[PDB]
Write a protein that binds this DNA or RNA. Structure first.
Lengths: 136, 113, 82, 165, 93, 47
RNA sequence: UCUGGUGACUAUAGCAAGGAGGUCACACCUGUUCCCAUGCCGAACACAGAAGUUAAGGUCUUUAGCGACGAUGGUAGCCAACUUACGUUCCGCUAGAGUAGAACGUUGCCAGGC
RNA sequence: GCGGUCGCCUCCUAAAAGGUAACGGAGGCGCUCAAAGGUUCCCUCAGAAUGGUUGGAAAUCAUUCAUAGAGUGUAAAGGC
């Protein structure tokens, strides 16, 4: 649950989802990057239900480096009521990804682990992924 | 040792803020004086294209002298370039212009004015 | 069906119709309005004047000219030409 | 005396202590900002107003804390009088060598400052002492902070014989 | 590295994406003696840049005349394909 | 603040109407104003 | 034609280092005797005088490291248009920002001792 | 139905002229001031640390890094 602390406004607009990526199209903190190939809203809960799990495969082995942080906090109403008497209280945090962006970064550990670990991790996210080998 | 201030800087800097309403049109050309360390100046100016319309000088040396506030300061306070020019607007960046550069503002208040 | 928790919002004010009111290069009358805005976005230039901290108006007839002043500040002007 | 004692020893050293190009890159004494303080917001501050009539030349201005964090901040009290040495009083209660009328903490440090603005504090009852402790034997804070004519401590140091500390 | 390109054509309609599957890339030399007089290169002779320079050094050009050492500097890598578009050189003077 | 009223004795007419605090200055104030039928700034009594 | 003075240019005009000269002219330089005056000290604000000097400023000449202007080749975006169901794709126009190679240590206006 | 709102001012939505809706998302006003008004002078912001009864990391005037990141009687934007 990667969330912030101090926010000026608590109710915001749904982010725009069209077009290619902007920044973070490469990998730094480790040899190996997991790219993204479609568009969606990753929603902090995926991240910590696809981080603890990747480390439970990693058995507290090597180290990871996350390349996605949810900023715009999405809101939602509780029980199904009438339409329109205000906005629902914030209940989530979302991050938007576009095709061509490295989401995770790791170092040192063997490529067998890299493949058989990011395949474990992608099985939680609603975006379709593809391996990247730091292919200079 | 610490930063000492130049003063030509703020002298022309103030000439700026003072040069936002007054400007010689030659129908009323302002005369505008570069005080110096020992001497004083003046010049009539027209302000349509920045050419130099009229001119005299204190330092011109029909006579030199000392005492920056001298009757030489009031002969520069009289001199003209004879034309159809009337009681000008005294450009002043120097405090108490009604008395400080009144050396210039005094003698010419009758003939140029 | 159930009395809702209402809205702590709903207030705004009437728009004022700011902006330019005469186009660059067209002929005017003495005394006409050229621009209406809060603060001096465009300074008054030649033969124009500022009213009560707004309404840059014309002072003589002629054609208007929009122009730059220093590096980043503009200005308006009127020329007597007929 | 002292104003000329800002000359009687120094014109030849301050014409030689450096070996610059012309006489005027080679400096003089840097000016002072004789300031006093208080530790009470009411009466010690309202009644620590003359000690300047004693030491400085300023009658008494009323500047307050600016930066003024949680409990520093107050308004308009005469805790810091701006008696900075301009030219006339620029030979003020500062270069009086009455800092020996204590015989403690003369040489305080190995050096003075990494910020050229030096601070020389008559902490205690070190200064203004030629006056007997009549009303000056109560709370009284000082603030002798001013720059000198030397970029670092280095050449500032081994010609500092003026105030000898 | 002896790699040769040629002067390609401007006034391009964007109908080139489809003549692009068949290999090419743009390329434009910087430096005096000539200008941004672009040159067109192909890829599967760059399937062997592996041995050519590394990344920092010399390449022949054979670009008609003024065939000297020219340095491909910038990077214009492309997402989603493992393709490439507009890699470009410069003169050494 | 409370509303006041000024009038030039010579004209004996109260046309000008200004404001004044009942704490800042409670003492009756008086200034020179241009009252009608006089063509001169006479003294006004803020009653 | 050098400097001093006025009026144009988008810091191309700069802050960051220095280099070197003179007081014709800007400067550092003497105090309150006077004009004015710091609720505060004649450093800013003034005066008569200058025996003493060129550091600095001032001017040129150097550093493209310090920052703006940043010509092409692309590319995002977009106006029509034919398709398909678009987080698109093809076809025609206008094509950016950022990134380079660069220009880069101002063009002059009109006067004074020459 | 219950509840809450009903006038005037500032911004976003509003798609680079103006105008533009919802029980859409944020704040305010029902004044105050003889001076905080007119005129002539004169001056200059923050975030920065110095080591100065005392220190409340912050009670002070300096000094220099200070580019408007300060201050505007009152909310917010446009301005200086």
């Amino acid at each position: 649950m990667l969330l912030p602390k101090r926010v000026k406004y608590r109710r915001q607009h749904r982010p725009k989802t069209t077009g290619r990526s902007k920044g973070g199209n490469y990998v730094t903190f480790g040899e190996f990057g997991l790219q993204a190939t479609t568009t969606s809203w990753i929603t902090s809960r995926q991240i910590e239900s696809a981080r603890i799990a990747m480390t439970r495969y990693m058995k507290r082995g090597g180290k990871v480096w996350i390349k996605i942080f949810p900023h715009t906090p999405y809101t939602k109403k509780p029980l199904e009521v009438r339409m329109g008497a205000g906005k629902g209280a914030v209940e989530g945090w979302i991050a938007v990804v576009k095709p061509g962006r490295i989401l995770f970064e790791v170092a040192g550990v063997s490529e067998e682990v890299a493949r058989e670990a990011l395949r474990l991790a992608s099985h939680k996210l609603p975006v379709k992924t593809k391996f990247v080998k730091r292919e200079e | 040792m610490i930063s000492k201030i130049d003063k030509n800087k703020v002298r022309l800097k103030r000439h700026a803020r003072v040069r936002t309403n007054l400007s010689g049109t030659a129908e009323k050309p302002r005369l505008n004086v570069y005080r110096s360390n020992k001497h004083i100046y003046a010049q009539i100016i027209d302000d349509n294209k920045g050419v130099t319309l009229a001119q005299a000088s204190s330092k011109d040396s029909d006579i030199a002298t000392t005492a920056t506030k001298v009757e030489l300061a009031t002969k520069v306070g009289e001199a003209i370039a004879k034309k159809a020019a009337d009681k000008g607007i005294k450009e002043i960046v120097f405090d108490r212009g009604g008395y400080l550069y009144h050396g210039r503002v005094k003698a010419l208040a009758e003939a140029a004015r | 069906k159930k009395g809702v928790s209402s809205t702590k919002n709903g207030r705004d004010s009437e728009s004022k119709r700011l902006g330019a009111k005469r186009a660059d290069g067209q002929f005017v009358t003495g005394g006409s309005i050229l621009y209406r805005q809060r603060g001096t976005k465009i300074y008054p230039g030649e033969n124009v004047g500022r009213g009560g901290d707004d309404t840059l108006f014309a002072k003589i007839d002629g054609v208007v000219k929009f122009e730059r002043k220093g590096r980043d500040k503009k200005q308006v002007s009127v020329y007597a030409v007929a | 005396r002292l104003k000329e004692k800002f000359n009687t020893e120094v014109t030849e050293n301050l014409m030689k202590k450096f070996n610059y190009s012309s006489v005027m890159e080679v400096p003089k004494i840097d000016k002072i900002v004789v300031n006093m303080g208080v530790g009470d917001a009411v009466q010690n501050s309202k009644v620590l107003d003359n000690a300047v009539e004693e030491l400085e030349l300023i009658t008494g201005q009323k500047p307050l804390v600016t930066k003024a964090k949680k409990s520093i901040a107050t308004f308009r009290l005469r805790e810091g009088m701006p008696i900075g040495a301009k030219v006339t009083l620029r030979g003020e209660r500062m270069y009086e060598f009455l800092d020996k009328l204590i015989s403690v903490s003369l040489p305080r440090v190995r050096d003075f400052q990494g910020v050229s603005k030096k601070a020389f504090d008559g902490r205690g009852n070190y200064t203004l002492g030629v006056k007997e402790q009549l009303i000056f034997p109560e709370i009284d804070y000082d603030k002798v902070s001013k720059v000198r004519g030397m970029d670092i401590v280095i050449v500032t140091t081994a010609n500092t014989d003026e105030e000898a500390r | 590295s002896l790699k040769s390109i040629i002067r390609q054509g401007k006034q391009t309609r964007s109908d080139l994406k489809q003549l692009r599957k068949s290999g090419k890339v743009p390329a434009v030399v910087y430096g005096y003696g000539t200008k941004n007089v672009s040159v067109k290169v192909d890829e599967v002779e760059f399937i062997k840049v592996i041995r050519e320079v590394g990344r920092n050094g010399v390449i022949e050009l054979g670009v008609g005349s003024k065939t000297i050492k020219v340095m491909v500097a910038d990077y214009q890598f492309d997402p989603l394909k493992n393709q490439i578009t507009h890699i470009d050189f410069l003169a050494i003077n | 603040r409370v509303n006041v009223t000024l009038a030039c004795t010579e004209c004996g007419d109260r046309n000008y109407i200004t404001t004044k605090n009942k704490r800042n200055n409670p003492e009756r104030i008086e200034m020179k104003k241009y009252c009608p039928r006089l063509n001169k700034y006479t003294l006004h009594r803020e009653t």
